[PDB]
């Protein structure tokens, strides 16, 4: 719970209210408590919350907590012993029943019972044989569950089985209405009716569980409770005893037929009633009726008939016991209508109002026959039963109101309670205007005034009694119950006030109180209080009901006086203080009330409580407050003139508001162990406690508390202005901002909660006038700082605060310090930012620059310096046993101001670990210590924000910034860096390192937006250039890498903060790395322009950033050489640099080359006043005396120069005296003078190039290679600077690679799994190809070993997984599109030379390891397989190489590896490669070589323009066919495109291919038949096993939509089908491409068979014609498989249709092809007929007819695609020429068959009584249309790829 200070504070305030009372209980013994248990009953007055009694609640708990263990009743809802039911001791039962019933009454007399501080024995004591304990607990528990649902459903015991199921079964413990052998039922109407048949067989019980038991008759007469359960568990399983006990109690009641039988009957009845109430609370008719109303629905009318006070006979025990249960169930709508109709809800006579009028009379007599409890209970029940409005009118038709008004006349009776309940029910039912005119005309609108007068007089009839609440505050003095009944009266009257008000107000303009209402005006203690709140409610309603009567009743004299006493009665009433404008504001304009308001000047009277936290708490500190802060603006609309009052009527008080504050408690406290604020050692004692670091007092204090609601209303009103339109004009905020310092403004300003309502309101001036102080605020702010600059100016050594502990030092200033810091952070956050943009604040800021400039920053430097040095210092004095939990800064809410991650204790993952123990040193300080860094570094982020501005701000601004802003930055950079300028390395380490971290963080424009780089301000960079501390760092780094030696677990992959001196070593260092990297990156930074451009009187002309890039780099090169002088790690070992840091170097190494194109002409200077145009000359002109204008005349006349002369026109000789004094003999030095490349001369390549050569002269770029092995693996990416050094050469690394080739066997397995790595980089030397052209000898000088490497079982080379690729480099060269390196020895005027020397990979070499190639098969890795495949595909070159690679077994490896896959990820690349493979793997010479050769006059010809298709425009565009088979391609080219336009004379000038060919059976019936090798016979069987292994399953997918985003979208999800799709695609593709693949399937069978002309083993073909494609399934079990089958219906069509193709190549013309070969022509028809039978199979067995359906469904689609030679995935590979005889020799072919009309009988073969049989043939009709239509002329992810596409 968000127990914000206010909430819990109110909770304690409750204690003061009644803790003094409960002291009675808290301060008494248990026996005394025991005596009081039943001596309390219920309040004489209203209910109360039990929070303050939470202690007494737990007292009762303990009193009755262990008693569960007293008889073991402490039960586990996991141990099935049920804590054996043994009788609880009567007095101990009473000890419990006392508190139970006392707890029962407490609940029933308490309100807001959600505290739950007296539980813990919940399921436990109820486990007792006696119903006394068991039923008392059952009742109180039903009530508890009701309150719990009343809380919309505090223990979470719902997991219990024992009690939960006990109650669930008690819902039908035995039965609701029951039935007996006699016609009677034991009807519910038999509450106490022993006047019916009473079966005696129920002396026993029988309980199966199949474990059946008995308690036979008269056996359950001596065995009682304990013995019953003993023999039960003897007969029963110990776990289950519930129904045994239920029926045993039933029998024990039965055991006799005496009062015990009736008594125990009532007891079990009430148990069941509590169970039913709770069940309906938790269960619903879906469950309730599901349990009973299939058992005994004799409930509704029964209950309607059971009980009635008219039936004043029922022993009220069960009557009431049901009542509340009955009531609870009746609350439901389902049951409401039930008993409503049972009563006959339109009677006025039945029990509906029979009892109503009976009780009405009972009230008139008041003969103590009035059970106030029962009375009020049904009152409120019917209040609840007002639920059903239609039945509300039904009752309105049941003589509703007048039947009720019989009671309204019953007064002067003692039953104020039931009288109050009657008023409440009356208020409840009132909904109708027809009910109004009923009541009004019933004469009910006379008993109103009747009771009015009666009780108004009665008020003074009993001043003697007047016994208000005793133990609670009583504003009034009259007896409680009376004026509570009156509260009900007033509520009813008010709610009636609004409706039908005009006529009735006229009726009772003088109700018997109207003129005597003044009774109430002053009868505060006589007529009660907060009833006057309800009089105000009347007034407001009147102020809206009939304001016209206001002046009329102003004449009554009551209204005018109210204004007279109005100032006095203004007080703490939220309602009033919420409804005040509703009552007052509007009347300000009503003439009568207008004058009445104007008199006395009521505005000031309104506020009065202005300085009263009571009222602030009253108004909720919000909402109502804020709401009111918006509402009371209504009078402002009425009377803006009063605003001056509402302005000053308060400012008299507001302006005093700062003056209000009083001194308050301490904030710092010394340790009650040594009286010290801070721990002085790592091993220091803990001032242990479970307190909270922050003492919450201010907000709790009236000033904070009041100001809460204050700001609430402030933000309500000031919103849109108001008095604030004049308060700034009246009051000055800064003058008023003493509220910002207050008196003791504590540490807990972090509790600055009203800020929004504070700052947001303040923004209105930010909207109106920041300049309404702003710089003034900050000036007085500084003033304060200087005032605080007392122990701010403290020792620079360490924490004197630690030393001075036990003293008032900070205590004195403490609160002010945090006050100030946090308030300023807030000010900055809200206002001070680059977002302001307003020129006015810009100029005011400039005015500040003028008056002080920057000196504040010095105080800031000192403060920050002292800031955490202490904690840093104390940290060593600070118990890490305490830091580990305390960890001041590493605490919740610490998220901003770029935390320069600090030295934490545990993993930062866990962070805050408070709450266990506290310490005064921790407590008062942790609240502070955490704060400090937050207070700071938000300073620094803003400081950096003070840099760019106009560069990006550039709204209306001025020149002032020209000199000052530069002056400011100078007054900034060194000013704070001085803090660290001196700090050396260590001891300073912990503090200064982090300081440096954030320092590097700053100096960078806070620019990331698109995650970009902070833009690394140019200005401060140059202001540090003049500082040159870069070079200081270049010195330090010497220590730093050497500081490795002073340093573990790992190098690169360790994080978090426990302890790492190594981390300490480079912690700060890391930033300098990135800094320097981007330090060279002006491209990543802005681009300032040149000082030479700015200043013409200079030598160093240069763009600032561009020049400064270099000199840092020349010094960096010097440093590089220095470090390498020792070799550092440059050619050394120990892999010290972290892999991460090593990689980092590369960036830090890339920059090495990074260079500005133009030569850099040295770096010059910095000056704030020597700005262009020089202000210095004019400055000295008026320093001698010449005014600016006359002084300017010179520079504007000359510019960028200095006169240094006397007796000029503007510099007249009388200026000689004031110039000679100014003459310093250095006037020429009044301009910047060049800076230098420290330790060097040229801030340019002047030395960097020479030293680069020196590396090359010194061969360093190779010494690195020696140190690569440690972290070289991915550095390949950084082989590009390398590339530039090689462009310059100056050293050969091709020589290095050759030496490695020599060394490449010195690899000597090179740490297997590191062989391939370092050698991958080595081959990456090759990837630096250029020279790769040559070295063929060296290249061969290694390929010789490559041959010798052999590894015939490369499985022995897992590192060869991708040394596959490192070879693949040698592969790419291998043939280098072989072309036999032939010299064309022809007429050419172009080189076309051998750029790369390859020695064309002598063929004998290839076959050798190619034998190994096939002789290695399995090695490792999925992508190694990808490679291997792709290599062999690029290969399979000679096409006899391809032949041999066929039947290579490794094919089988591929098959039963991949197809055996269960779940793979990205085989897609292999799948593309394998499409191309199959194009190559089945590279049928004729069907590829002769294929192209037929396509040649169509490849080059390709239907030319009619024919140029220039060589490079065609030949280089023949790449597809070129690589189809470069060998067979050239062969096909051997006869191609003779080509013309050759320059006659043995000269060639042309490339437009045109004229002639290159110079211009083989197959057989089995050509594409015997090529079949029986692969399918088991290939497709294992393929199906891969596929038919439930290719329909839902994958283990979520996707955020497991089967709707990816099932009807991408059915491939199921991994099983993820490759079945591939199977289909590839198989159909290879079919289409080559005839044999089409023939490859015909003989498939589960077994294996091979016959002449492969005699069709019908298994294959028939199955294809059958389920093979259909794969029928029950239904759309999964959208994955469902959409799968859907797309398959889309696909199988195209699949088979393409199967019907011929070659899908050169002969695609098919212009007049009207036959196939002898073994193909019938293949066209072939197995079809089984489908004709399949069609006929459907025709028979109408369910078989229904079975086929989908086949038929497809059949129409199938037949349409067939005849029309069309499909969804068709013609994307085909030609319209293909369908020239295909369509013909299909349509006319079937015409030859004459088959179609036969299937028409298939329709004739059905009945028209199927839902889709009508629908089914519609598609057929087209198929029917297909019949002659075609021959009538006779007599997305879809992949479609052509052949050349392959």
Numbering used by the authors: 2 to 154, 158 to 213, 236 to 1073, 1076 to 1534, 1539 to 1592, 1598 to 1872, 2220 to 2230
Give excerpts from the publication.
In addition to the closed ring structure, the Tom1p^His^ dataset contains particles in “intermediate” and “open” conformations that were reconstructed to resolutions of 7.79 and 7.10 Å, respectively ([Fig fig7], S6C-D). The distinction between closed and open/intermediate conformations is modeled as a rigid body hinging of 30° (open) or 15° (intermediate) centered at a loop (1316-1320) in the middle of the Body domain at the opposite side of the ring from the N-terminal Head and C-terminal HECT domains ([Fig fig7], 7C). The resolution does not allow precise modeling of the change in conformation, but apart from the rigid body rotations, conformational changes appear to be limited to some repacking of the interface between the two halves of the Body domain and modest shift in adjacent helices ([Fig fig7]). When aligned separately, the N-terminal and C-terminal halves of closed, intermediate, and open conformation Tom1 superimpose closely. The hinging motion, centered on loop 1316-1320 (green), is ^∽^ 15° and ^∽^30° for the intermediate and open conformations, respectively. Published cryo-EM studies of human HUWE1 indicated the presence of movement towards an open state analogous to that of Tom1p, although density for residues C-terminal to the hinge were not apparent. Our structural analysis revealed a closed solenoidal ring structure and multiple open conformations suggestive of dynamic conformational changes to a spiral shape. One possibility is that this ∼29 kDa domain occupies the solenoidal basket, perhaps extending above the basket rim, and that it retains basic substrate proteins in the central region of the solenoid. It is also possible that the shift from the closed ring to the open spiral form is important for function. Mutations expected to destabilize closure of the ring conformation were reported to compromise E3 ligase activity of human HUWE1 and similar mutations of *Nematocida* HUWE1 were found to destabilize the protein.
